[PDB]
Structures are given as structure tokens and as C-alpha cells.
Amino acid sequence: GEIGQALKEIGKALKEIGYALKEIGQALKG
Amino acid sequence: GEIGQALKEIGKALKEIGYALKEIGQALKG
Amino acid sequence: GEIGQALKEIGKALKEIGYALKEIGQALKG
Amino acid sequence: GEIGQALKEIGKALKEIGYALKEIGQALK
Amino acid sequence: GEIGQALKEIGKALKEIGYALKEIGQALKG
Amino acid sequence: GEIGQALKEIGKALKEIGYALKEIGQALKG
């Protein structure tokens, strides 16, 4: 439905944020 | 609807947060 | 309504977070 | 109501995250 | 309810994210 | 339900973000 699909896109954006934070952590490790 | 469109804007703000973290990681990397 | 307005405030808070991250990335570039 | 109050608490958590990020920005200076 | 308790767990994770950012801020100036 | 399960995936993504931030903070110490 409308709300569920909108929540799935929010979940997708959060996974992308989580991925970007791992990259940051990798960068800080050298 | 009201709730669906409000969630959509939250989704956009989260994608923008992801983009900004991506840039931070690239700046730390380089 | 109650929920829609509360989701709008959450959306504004995420915009501010996104902005603060852009500021951090701009600092890291300068 | 139940959902609105839980969303207000989520907004409150987002304000503290914003605040911590601004302290991080100034720590980088 | 189902949704209320799910949103309370989301608030809980966000509070943990807040703390984690505080500790980053301390590691940075410290 | 659809919405409750979507919210649990969002909660899990946020716990993953908190965890990545703790790793960043630990890396900024050592």
C-alpha cells in the first residue's frame, strides 16, 4: 500500500546511510 | 495522502543525509 | 492532523541534520 | 495519542542528534 | 500496540545514535 | 502487519547505523 511502500523507501535510504558510515569507518582505518 | 506525502519528504531528507555522508567519506579518504 | 504534523516536524529535523552534515563535509574540504 | 506521542519522542531524539552533530562540527574547528 | 511499540524501538535506536555521536565528538576534541 | 514489519526493518537499520557510529568512535580513539 501507500504507507508501506513509503516505509520501504525510508528503509532503503537508511541502509544507504549505514553503508556510507561503514565507508567512513573504512576511511578512518586507512 | 497526508501521511504518504509526509513520509516521502522524510525519504528525501534521508537520501540527502546519505549523499552528505558519502561526501564526508570521500573527503576523509582523499 | 496529529500524525501528519508530527511527521512534518520529523522531516524538518532531518533537513537540519542533513545541513549539519554538509557543513561538516565542507569543513573537511577546507 | 499513542502514535503521536511516540513520534514526538522520535522528533526529540532527532533534535539531540542535530545538537551532537553541531558539536562535532565545532570540534573539527 | 504493534505500531506504538515499533515506534518506541525506533526512538530507542535514535537515542543510541545520539550517544554514539557524543562519543565521536569527545574522541575528536579529546 | 505490513506497517509493523516495515517499522521493524527501519528499527533494525537504525541499530545498524548506531553500531557503525560506535565503530567510527572507537577508530577515532585509536
Author numbering:
A (entry chain B), B (entry chain C), C (entry chain D), E (entry chain F), F (entry chain A): 1 to 30
D (entry chain E): 1 to 29
Direct quotes from the study:
Here we describe the successful de novo design and structural resolution of a coiled-coil peptide that assembles into multiple, distinct conformational states under the same conditions. The peptide forms an open αHB and a compact α-helical sandwich. We reasoned that introducing glycine (Gly, G) into this sequence should increase structural dynamics and potentially access alternative states, as Gly has the most backbone freedom of any α-amino acid, and it allows close approach of α helices. Therefore, we introduced Gly at all of the e sites to give CC-Type2-(LaIdGe)4.
Next, we crystallised and solved an X-ray structure for a 4-bromophenylalanine variant of CC-Type2-(LaIdGe)4. To our surprise, the asymmetric unit contained two distinct and strikingly different α-helical hexamers: an open, C6-symmetric barrel; and a closed, C2-symmetric sandwich with a consolidated hydrophobic core. To a first approximation, both structures have two three-helix sheets with similar helix–helix interfaces and KIH interactions expected for Type-2 coiled coils. The main difference is that the two α-helical sheets of the open state are related cyclically to give the C6 symmetry; whereas, those of the closed state is sheared perpendicular to the central C6 axis, to give a C2-symmetric bundle. As a result, in the latter, the aliphatic residues form a compact hydrophobic core. However, relative to the open barrel, the remaining chains of the closed state are rearranged significantly with average translations in the paired helices ‘3’, ‘4’, and ‘5’ of 5.92, 6.98, and 6.05 Å, respectively. We propose that the introduction of Gly at e’ in CC-Type2-(LaIdGe)4 perturbs this balance. The lack of side chain allows the helices to pack more closely together. This is apparent on closer examination of the structures: in the open state, the Cα atoms of the Ala-13 residue at g sites of neighbouring helices are spaced regularly at ≈9.3 Å; whereas, in the closed state the average distance is ≈8.8 Å. The helix–helix–helix angles are all ≈120˚ in the open state but vary between 90˚ and 150˚ in the close state.
